[PDB]
Design a protein around this ligand. Sequence first.
Ligand SMILES: O=C(NO)N[C@H](Cc1ccccc1)C(=O)O
Ligand SMILES: [Zn+2]
Length: 307
Amino acid sequence: ARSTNTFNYATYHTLDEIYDFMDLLVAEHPQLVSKLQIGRSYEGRPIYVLKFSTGGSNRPAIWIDLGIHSREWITQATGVWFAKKFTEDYGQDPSFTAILDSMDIFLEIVTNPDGFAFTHSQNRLWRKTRSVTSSSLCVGVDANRNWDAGFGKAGASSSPCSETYHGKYANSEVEVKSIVDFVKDHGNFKAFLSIHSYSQLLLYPYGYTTQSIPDKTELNQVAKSAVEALKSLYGTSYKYGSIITTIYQASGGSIDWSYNQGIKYSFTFELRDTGRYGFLLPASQIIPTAQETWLGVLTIMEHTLNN
Ligand SMILES: O=C(NO)N[C@H](Cc1ccccc1)C(=O)O
Ligand SMILES: [Zn+2]
Protein backbone atom coordinates (compact mmCIF):
# COMPACT_ATOMS: atom_id res chain seq x y z
CA ALA A 1 0.00 0.00 0.00
CA ARG A 2 1.44 3.35 -1.14
CA SER A 3 -1.57 5.41 -0.05
CA THR A 4 -4.31 4.91 2.54
CA ASN A 5 -6.48 4.74 -0.58
CA THR A 6 -4.83 1.52 -1.80
CA PHE A 7 -4.80 -0.11 1.63
CA ASN A 8 -7.02 -3.21 1.87
CA TYR A 9 -9.53 -2.57 4.67
CA ALA A 10 -11.28 -5.87 3.89
CA THR A 11 -8.47 -8.12 5.14
CA TYR A 12 -6.49 -8.73 8.35
CA HIS A 13 -3.06 -7.13 8.72
CA THR A 14 0.22 -7.57 10.60
CA LEU A 15 1.76 -5.16 13.12
CA ASP A 16 4.19 -3.68 10.56
CA GLU A 17 1.43 -3.03 8.04
CA ILE A 18 -0.71 -1.27 10.65
CA TYR A 19 2.23 0.85 11.83
CA ASP A 20 3.16 1.81 8.25
CA PHE A 21 -0.50 2.74 7.71
CA MET A 22 -0.28 5.22 10.58
CA ASP A 23 2.59 7.17 9.02
CA LEU A 24 0.84 7.29 5.65
CA LEU A 25 -2.31 8.72 7.25
CA VAL A 26 -0.29 11.37 9.13
CA ALA A 27 1.60 12.28 5.95
CA GLU A 28 -1.67 12.61 4.02
CA HIS A 29 -3.54 14.71 6.62
CA PRO A 30 -0.79 16.54 8.57
CA GLN A 31 -3.19 19.30 9.59
CA LEU A 32 -5.60 16.85 11.20
CA VAL A 33 -3.72 13.79 12.47
CA SER A 34 -0.54 13.34 14.51
CA LYS A 35 1.14 10.20 15.86
CA LEU A 36 2.19 10.12 19.52
CA GLN A 37 4.30 7.53 21.34
CA ILE A 38 3.08 7.04 24.92
CA GLY A 39 5.51 4.26 25.83
CA ARG A 40 7.14 0.96 24.88
CA SER A 41 5.80 -2.57 25.34
CA TYR A 42 7.47 -5.22 27.48
CA GLU A 43 9.32 -6.50 24.42
CA GLY A 44 10.36 -2.99 23.37
CA ARG A 45 7.75 -2.29 20.67
CA PRO A 46 6.57 1.32 20.48
CA ILE A 47 3.05 2.07 21.70
CA TYR A 48 1.33 4.54 19.37
CA VAL A 49 -1.75 6.72 19.75
CA LEU A 50 -3.28 8.71 16.89
CA LYS A 51 -4.56 12.18 17.74
CA PHE A 52 -7.26 13.80 15.61
CA SER A 53 -7.61 17.54 16.22
CA THR A 54 -8.55 20.75 14.41
CA GLY A 55 -6.71 22.95 16.91
CA GLY A 56 -7.14 24.47 20.34
CA SER A 57 -5.22 23.73 23.52
CA ASN A 58 -6.18 20.72 25.63
CA ARG A 59 -9.76 20.56 24.31
CA PRO A 60 -12.21 18.09 25.88
CA ALA A 61 -11.15 14.68 24.57
CA ILE A 62 -12.52 11.27 23.64
CA TRP A 63 -10.40 8.14 24.23
CA ILE A 64 -10.75 4.93 22.21
CA ASP A 65 -8.58 1.85 22.68
CA LEU A 66 -8.80 -1.37 20.70
CA GLY A 67 -6.99 -4.70 20.85
CA ILE A 68 -6.11 -4.84 24.56
CA HIS A 69 -6.91 -8.56 24.16
CA SER A 70 -4.69 -9.53 21.21
CA ARG A 71 -6.75 -12.39 19.74
CA GLU A 72 -9.72 -10.08 19.12
CA TRP A 73 -8.56 -9.22 15.57
CA ILE A 74 -11.85 -7.60 14.58
CA THR A 75 -11.01 -4.67 16.91
CA GLN A 76 -7.62 -3.71 15.40
CA ALA A 77 -9.19 -4.08 11.94
CA THR A 78 -12.02 -1.78 13.02
CA GLY A 79 -9.53 0.71 14.44
CA VAL A 80 -7.72 1.11 11.12
CA TRP A 81 -11.06 1.67 9.35
CA PHE A 82 -12.01 4.23 12.02
CA ALA A 83 -8.81 6.25 11.52
CA LYS A 84 -9.45 6.48 7.77
CA LYS A 85 -13.14 7.27 8.31
CA PHE A 86 -12.30 10.28 10.51
CA THR A 87 -10.23 11.90 7.77
CA GLU A 88 -12.92 11.32 5.14
CA ASP A 89 -15.99 12.43 7.10
CA TYR A 90 -14.60 15.68 8.51
CA GLY A 91 -16.16 18.44 6.43
CA GLN A 92 -18.63 16.03 4.80
CA ASP A 93 -20.76 14.82 7.70
CA PRO A 94 -22.29 17.71 9.73
CA SER A 95 -22.51 15.71 12.94
CA PHE A 96 -18.92 14.43 13.00
CA THR A 97 -17.62 17.77 11.75
CA ALA A 98 -19.19 19.58 14.71
CA ILE A 99 -17.63 17.04 17.08
CA LEU A 100 -14.10 17.49 15.73
CA ASP A 101 -14.42 21.29 15.67
CA SER A 102 -14.85 21.23 19.45
CA MET A 103 -13.19 18.03 20.67
CA ASP A 104 -10.04 15.96 20.10
CA ILE A 105 -10.06 12.20 19.59
CA PHE A 106 -7.31 9.85 20.74
CA LEU A 107 -7.23 6.44 19.05
CA GLU A 108 -5.02 3.54 20.14
CA ILE A 109 -5.37 0.84 17.47
CA VAL A 110 -2.92 -1.69 18.96
CA THR A 111 -3.01 -1.46 22.77
CA ASN A 112 -1.21 -4.80 23.22
CA PRO A 113 1.42 -5.04 20.43
CA ASP A 114 3.47 -7.87 21.98
CA GLY A 115 0.38 -10.06 22.16
CA PHE A 116 -0.71 -9.09 18.65
CA ALA A 117 2.64 -10.18 17.15
CA PHE A 118 2.40 -13.49 19.01
CA THR A 119 -1.09 -14.22 17.60
CA HIS A 120 0.43 -13.85 14.12
CA SER A 121 3.56 -15.86 14.93
CA GLN A 122 2.82 -18.62 17.44
CA ASN A 123 -0.70 -18.75 18.87
CA ARG A 124 -3.73 -17.17 17.17
CA LEU A 125 -5.79 -17.33 20.38
CA TRP A 126 -3.35 -15.67 22.80
CA ARG A 127 -5.02 -12.84 24.75
CA LYS A 128 -2.58 -11.65 27.44
CA THR A 129 0.56 -9.51 27.32
CA ARG A 130 3.99 -11.16 27.13
CA SER A 131 5.64 -10.13 30.41
CA VAL A 132 7.73 -12.67 32.34
CA THR A 133 6.86 -13.52 35.95
CA SER A 134 9.61 -13.90 38.56
CA SER A 135 8.70 -17.33 39.92
CA SER A 136 6.71 -19.09 37.18
CA LEU A 137 7.07 -20.57 33.71
CA CYS A 138 3.85 -18.94 32.54
CA VAL A 139 3.86 -15.73 30.53
CA GLY A 140 1.56 -12.71 30.47
CA VAL A 141 -1.16 -10.78 32.25
CA ASP A 142 -4.79 -10.07 31.32
CA ALA A 143 -4.37 -6.36 30.61
CA ASN A 144 -8.08 -5.74 31.26
CA ARG A 145 -7.82 -6.98 34.86
CA ASN A 146 -4.62 -5.08 35.69
CA TRP A 147 -6.27 -1.67 36.29
CA ASP A 148 -6.60 0.01 39.69
CA ALA A 149 -10.34 -0.59 40.15
CA GLY A 150 -11.23 -3.30 42.64
CA PHE A 151 -7.84 -4.78 41.75
CA GLY A 152 -7.19 -8.30 43.01
CA LYS A 153 -10.83 -8.83 43.97
CA ALA A 154 -13.21 -11.54 42.80
CA GLY A 155 -13.43 -11.66 39.02
CA ALA A 156 -9.75 -12.21 38.26
CA SER A 157 -7.14 -14.90 38.97
CA SER A 158 -4.03 -14.71 41.15
CA SER A 159 -2.44 -17.60 39.24
CA PRO A 160 0.21 -16.52 36.66
CA CYS A 161 -0.82 -19.36 34.32
CA SER A 162 -4.46 -18.27 34.24
CA GLU A 163 -6.02 -16.68 31.16
CA THR A 164 -7.41 -14.04 33.53
CA TYR A 165 -4.27 -13.45 35.64
CA HIS A 166 -4.47 -9.90 37.06
CA GLY A 167 -0.73 -9.41 37.57
CA LYS A 168 1.57 -8.67 40.50
CA TYR A 169 -0.02 -5.30 41.28
CA ALA A 170 -2.26 -2.65 39.77
CA ASN A 171 -0.68 -1.02 36.71
CA SER A 172 2.21 -3.50 36.71
CA GLU A 173 1.91 -3.90 32.92
CA VAL A 174 3.65 -1.10 31.03
CA GLU A 175 0.94 -1.23 28.33
CA VAL A 176 -1.59 -0.20 31.00
CA LYS A 177 0.49 2.27 33.01
CA SER A 178 1.32 4.11 29.77
CA ILE A 179 -2.37 4.83 29.28
CA VAL A 180 -2.95 5.70 32.94
CA ASP A 181 -0.19 8.35 33.03
CA PHE A 182 -1.22 9.83 29.70
CA VAL A 183 -4.88 10.20 30.67
CA LYS A 184 -4.07 11.58 34.14
CA ASP A 185 -1.54 14.08 32.78
CA HIS A 186 -4.02 15.23 30.10
CA GLY A 187 -6.80 15.65 32.65
CA ASN A 188 -9.53 16.72 30.22
CA PHE A 189 -11.01 13.47 28.88
CA LYS A 190 -14.83 13.31 28.77
CA ALA A 191 -15.37 9.85 27.27
CA PHE A 192 -13.43 6.59 27.48
CA LEU A 193 -14.26 3.66 25.16
CA SER A 194 -12.68 0.19 25.04
CA ILE A 195 -13.38 -2.08 22.05
CA HIS A 196 -13.44 -5.88 22.40
CA SER A 197 -15.05 -9.00 20.87
CA TYR A 198 -17.12 -11.03 20.85
CA SER A 199 -20.76 -11.34 22.05
CA GLN A 200 -22.37 -8.13 20.69
CA LEU A 201 -22.78 -6.16 23.92
CA LEU A 202 -22.51 -2.53 25.05
CA LEU A 203 -21.50 -2.21 28.70
CA TYR A 204 -21.06 0.49 31.35
CA PRO A 205 -19.63 0.34 34.94
CA TYR A 206 -19.27 -1.48 37.18
CA GLY A 207 -17.82 -4.96 36.87
CA TYR A 208 -16.06 -5.39 40.22
CA THR A 209 -18.87 -4.26 42.56
CA THR A 210 -22.65 -4.76 42.65
CA GLN A 211 -22.97 -1.07 43.52
CA SER A 212 -24.88 1.00 40.94
CA ILE A 213 -23.22 4.08 39.47
CA PRO A 214 -24.77 7.52 40.22
CA ASP A 215 -25.20 8.12 36.48
CA LYS A 216 -26.93 4.82 35.71
CA THR A 217 -30.11 6.38 34.30
CA GLU A 218 -28.25 8.57 31.79
CA LEU A 219 -25.69 6.02 30.58
CA ASN A 220 -28.41 3.41 30.25
CA GLN A 221 -30.38 5.65 27.86
CA VAL A 222 -27.21 6.60 25.98
CA ALA A 223 -26.42 2.89 25.60
CA LYS A 224 -29.95 2.14 24.41
CA SER A 225 -29.73 4.85 21.73
CA ALA A 226 -26.32 3.66 20.60
CA VAL A 227 -27.46 0.06 20.02
CA GLU A 228 -30.57 1.24 18.17
CA ALA A 229 -28.34 3.29 15.87
CA LEU A 230 -25.93 0.38 15.39
CA LYS A 231 -28.74 -2.07 14.54
CA SER A 232 -30.27 0.21 11.89
CA LEU A 233 -27.63 -0.68 9.29
CA TYR A 234 -27.62 -4.49 9.08
CA GLY A 235 -29.95 -5.50 11.90
CA THR A 236 -27.21 -6.71 14.24
CA SER A 237 -28.68 -7.20 17.73
CA TYR A 238 -26.86 -5.89 20.81
CA LYS A 239 -27.68 -6.20 24.50
CA TYR A 240 -26.68 -3.58 27.06
CA GLY A 241 -26.27 -3.00 30.78
CA SER A 242 -23.63 -2.88 33.50
CA ILE A 243 -20.77 -5.40 33.30
CA ILE A 244 -21.61 -7.34 36.44
CA THR A 245 -25.34 -7.74 35.65
CA THR A 246 -24.89 -8.52 31.94
CA ILE A 247 -21.88 -10.85 32.00
CA TYR A 248 -20.50 -11.52 35.49
CA GLN A 249 -18.20 -10.03 38.12
CA ALA A 250 -14.82 -8.90 36.73
CA SER A 251 -12.18 -6.84 38.53
CA GLY A 252 -9.43 -4.50 37.38
CA GLY A 253 -11.32 -3.33 34.30
CA SER A 254 -10.47 -0.21 32.30
CA ILE A 255 -13.86 1.51 32.26
CA ASP A 256 -14.29 0.90 35.99
CA TRP A 257 -11.02 2.77 36.45
CA SER A 258 -11.86 5.56 33.98
CA TYR A 259 -15.27 6.15 35.55
CA ASN A 260 -13.70 6.43 39.02
CA GLN A 261 -11.36 9.05 37.56
CA GLY A 262 -14.39 11.19 36.74
CA ILE A 263 -14.74 10.21 33.07
CA LYS A 264 -18.53 9.89 33.01
CA TYR A 265 -19.01 8.40 29.54
CA SER A 266 -17.16 5.10 29.97
CA PHE A 267 -18.31 2.23 27.74
CA THR A 268 -16.99 -1.14 26.61
CA PHE A 269 -18.03 -2.63 23.26
CA GLU A 270 -18.02 -6.37 22.51
CA LEU A 271 -18.34 -6.66 18.70
CA ARG A 272 -19.38 -9.49 16.33
CA ASP A 273 -20.29 -12.09 16.34
CA THR A 274 -22.46 -14.50 18.95
CA GLY A 275 -20.30 -17.59 18.67
CA ARG A 276 -20.54 -18.92 15.12
CA TYR A 277 -16.99 -17.78 14.35
CA GLY A 278 -16.06 -16.15 17.65
CA PHE A 279 -12.57 -14.67 17.62
CA LEU A 280 -11.99 -15.97 14.09
CA LEU A 281 -14.50 -13.71 12.34
CA PRO A 282 -14.26 -13.94 8.50
CA ALA A 283 -12.46 -11.08 6.74
CA SER A 284 -15.62 -10.38 4.74
CA GLN A 285 -17.36 -9.14 7.90
CA ILE A 286 -14.70 -6.55 8.73
CA ILE A 287 -16.23 -3.61 6.88
CA PRO A 288 -19.88 -4.30 7.81
CA THR A 289 -18.85 -4.57 11.47
CA ALA A 290 -16.83 -1.36 11.32
CA GLN A 291 -19.65 0.51 9.56
CA GLU A 292 -22.33 -0.38 12.13
CA THR A 293 -20.00 0.05 15.13
CA TRP A 294 -19.21 3.55 13.86
CA LEU A 295 -22.88 4.58 14.13
CA GLY A 296 -23.02 3.43 17.74
CA VAL A 297 -19.78 5.19 18.64
CA LEU A 298 -20.83 8.40 16.88
CA THR A 299 -24.07 8.36 18.91
CA ILE A 300 -22.11 8.39 22.17
CA MET A 301 -19.79 11.12 20.85
CA GLU A 302 -22.76 13.35 19.99
CA HIS A 303 -24.15 12.97 23.50
CA THR A 304 -20.73 13.76 25.00
CA LEU A 305 -20.54 16.99 23.00
CA ASN A 306 -23.84 18.42 24.28
CA ASN A 307 -23.44 17.39 27.93
O1 LIG B 1 -14.60 -12.58 26.32
C1 LIG B 1 -14.28 -11.42 26.57
N1 LIG B 1 -13.85 -10.57 25.62
O2 LIG B 1 -13.51 -9.25 25.96
N2 LIG B 1 -14.32 -10.86 27.79
C2 LIG B 1 -14.76 -11.56 29.00
C3 LIG B 1 -15.97 -10.82 29.67
C4 LIG B 1 -15.79 -9.34 29.99
C5 LIG B 1 -16.01 -8.34 29.00
C6 LIG B 1 -15.83 -6.96 29.31
C7 LIG B 1 -15.42 -6.57 30.61
C8 LIG B 1 -15.20 -7.56 31.60
C9 LIG B 1 -15.38 -8.93 31.29
C10 LIG B 1 -13.57 -11.65 29.98
O3 LIG B 1 -13.54 -12.37 30.93
O4 LIG B 1 -12.55 -10.83 29.67
ZN1 LIG C 1 -11.58 -8.61 25.18
